[PDB]
Paper text:
Lysine-specific demethylase 1 ([name]), the first identified histone demethylase is also known as KDM1A, AOF2, or BHC110. It is a flavin adenine dinucleotide (FAD)-dependent histone demethylase responsible for removing mono (me1)- and dimethyl (me2) groups from histone H3 lysine 4 (H3K4) and lysine 9 (H3K9) residues. [name] functions in transcriptional repression as a component of the CoREST (co-repressor for element-1-silencing transcription factor) complex and the NuRD (nucleosome remodeling and histone deacetylation) complex by demethylating H3K4me1/me2. Via its modulation of gene expression programs, [name] is an essential regulator of stem cell differentiation in both embryonic and adult cells.
We previously developed an N-alkylated trans-2-phenylcyclopropylamine (2-PCPA)-based inhibitor, S2157, in reference to the 2-PCPA-based cell-permeable [name] inhibitor, S2101. In this study, we downsized the N-alkyl group of S2157 to synthesize a compound named [name] and investigated its efficacy as an [name] inhibitor. [name] exhibited stronger [name] inhibitory activity than S2157 (Ki value of 0.27 ± 0.06 vs. 0.37 ± 0.08 µM), while the other three enzymes were not inhibited. [name] had a kinact/Ki value of 9800 ± 570 M−1 s−1, which was better than the reported value of 7800 M−1 s−1 for S2157. To analyze the mechanism of inhibition, we next solved the crystal structure of [name] in complex with [name]. In the crystal resolved at 2.62 Å, [name] formed a covalently linked adduct with FAD in the catalytic center of [name], through a cyclopropyl carbon atom. The overall structure of the [name]–[name] adduct was similar to that of [name]–S2101 or [name]–S2157, suggesting that [name] can inactivate [name] by a mechanism similar to those inhibitors. The adduct of [name]−FAD and nearby residues of [name] are colored magenta and orange, respectively. [name] exhibits efficient brain penetration and a reduced inhibitory constant (Ki) compared to both S2101 and S2157. Thirty minutes after a single injection of 30 mg/kg via the intraperitoneal route, [name] reached a brain concentration of 1.52 ± 0.14 µM and a maximum plasma concentration of 0.75 ± 0.09 µM at 0.5 h, indicating a good brain-to-plasma concentration ratio (2.06 ± 0.39).
Author numbering: 171 to 465, 473 to 784, 792 to 832
Write the structure that this text describes.
Amino acid sequence: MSGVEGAAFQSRLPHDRMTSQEAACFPDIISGPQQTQKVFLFIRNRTLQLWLDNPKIQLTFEATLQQLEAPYNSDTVLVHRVHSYLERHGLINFGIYKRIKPLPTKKTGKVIIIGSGVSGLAAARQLQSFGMDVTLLEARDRVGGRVATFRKGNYVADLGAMVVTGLGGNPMAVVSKQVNMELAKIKQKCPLYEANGQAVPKEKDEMVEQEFNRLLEATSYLSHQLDFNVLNNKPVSLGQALEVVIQLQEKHVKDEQIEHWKKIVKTQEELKELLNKMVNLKEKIKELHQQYKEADITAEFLVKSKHRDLTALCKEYDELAETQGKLEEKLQELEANPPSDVYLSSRDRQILDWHFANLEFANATPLSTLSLKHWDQDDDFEFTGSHLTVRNGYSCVPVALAEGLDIKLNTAVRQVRYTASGCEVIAVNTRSTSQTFIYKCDAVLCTLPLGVLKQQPPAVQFVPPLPEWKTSAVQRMGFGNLNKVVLCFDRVFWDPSVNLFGHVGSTTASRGELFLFWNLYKAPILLALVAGEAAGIMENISDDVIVGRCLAILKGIFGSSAVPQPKETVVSRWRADPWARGSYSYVAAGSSGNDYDLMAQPITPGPPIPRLFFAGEHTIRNYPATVHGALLSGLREAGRIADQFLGA
Ligand SMILES: Cc1cc2nc3c(=O)[nH]c(=O)nc-3n(C[C@H](O)[C@H](O)[C@H](O)COP(=O)(O)OP(=O)(O)OC[C@H]3O[C@@H](n4cnc5c(N)ncnc54)[C@H](O)[C@@H]3O)c2cc1C
Ligand SMILES: O=CCCc1cc(F)cc(F)c1OCc1ccccc1
């Protein structure tokens, strides 16, 4: 594919037609001749290409006009329109870049942003570029939110986001170039170790995995082909459907076991009756063998008759022992080819629970909480390319984003007042909570995590309270959990050529406890994941004991002598973290992707213009629970807000 077509793809745009969004802002193009539309698209793609080819400097209108070839560089008005649209919507001149045109010194409109994670920072930089007065209020003593990098000595380790999900179409590709993230592709191989330390043999790792795929497709067939979505008044969870399809495979195994037993018994009865019938014939021949020995002309003919009759019963017998053979032959082969005894052996199921845990990792919640119909509604939006880890720590992104922003750390928002005339945010200093702050403004952008919005009683009071249609969405939606244990050693004792290895838990309930180990970093560091039901429960374990359990697993895989005591350790507790209350959102049973749209919807105080805006990973339907989705949501909101307070 070409250069300009690649730029559309990298911007998540169809290279050869206009989006609905573009059709709204450029109606004259839609109703116009086909030729002009083709010219529009080329101007849009080429502008994106100029920006994506060098995202480190601002791409100005003037510079765009100068790098277009004829006849495109001659339609100055259209070029400005396109450049302005792309800039407003954050498709060019986003992230951190050298400004050509320095910042307008008289600001226009005052926006408070709640929260200094990627969504807040991304919006903030936009709004600051559009010439507004932006202040962020962050409760932690750092920026980044759920991007949190641990650094001590040579050790670098991410406690929140750590993976970049393909660069094709990914806005983080731009930010990576801007910020100089060291990215590294993740090697796919992931050996598993049973709870006793033994490696899972390849036959089984392969067999179980393929059966995990088949099981999971069956739940999709149930949902998206049989409408198995609402059972006895309740929406079906993924975990529930998974139980169903396992139960049928178990039924299928039991039934072919029954058919086999029936085939055995039938052949045994045949042999039992045939042998008895052969028994009676030996007796019948016993009595004729006796008459033949006793034996005149009627005697001379008596012998021929007795011989003719004695050998006829031997033909009957020899012919039955022939059938005797082809039965006990058919029997012997059936006693040797039993079908499966059980669908899953005890070890097989434990290994299968690993794959389930891996999916509870990806979604941050136990499977029995996920919406069967919608849990993967975002799959059509995945980026192309291999996944990467941030070898220098993902915190480099929000820290770069924070440069030059008016960011008030240790400032926790307690109440958001919004009315038709303006807004007031009330916050306390987390170091001296008697100290209070009152921030007047024209608009509030709320990037508070869904976990904080769900908090009952509320951590942040809204005045007037949020409308029912918004609170209903917040209650319906899922906010999951996921935790990491960071182990820093003075020497690498694991396989260096492997990024991942799995610990197969002993029980289904605990299947997510320390189930996946990551080797990601220059220094000798391991990350152990705690997923599913284990995530929330493990937060109540002291660090010394949970690390002891890691070392117990690792000493089982590598030997008790090869595993030294760690020099430094860190354990996340995202659920108990008051500024997150969880890891990220998931589509809960009974929710749907539509709730992500309602989360993004701004609030207008009744009689009118909107004042309270929403960004964050829980507000972007096609990219939830990700860093880039948070980034995209901040860009989106900055465009929405600038449209309102500067003009569309
Ligand atoms: C353990 C873990 C692993 C993850 N794995 C990945 C991964 O590899 N890749 C990926 O793309 N995503 C992953 N994610 C998800 C990703 O980190 C998030 O989607 C993303 O960080 C969303 O950030 P946000 O800006 O929307 O919210 P946040 O980063 O939470 O920002 C909200 C901010 O508001 C602040 N705040 C809270 N309450 C208040 C208050 N009262 N007043 C003021 N400020 C307040 C918070 O401190 C925070 O800074 C993971 C997340 C976690 C936690
Ligand atoms: O550590 C953080 C993982 C959380 C996460 C949340 C998402 F919504 C999407 C992700 F890509 C993702 O991170 C990498 C990943 C990819 C596939 C399966 C599991 C994890």
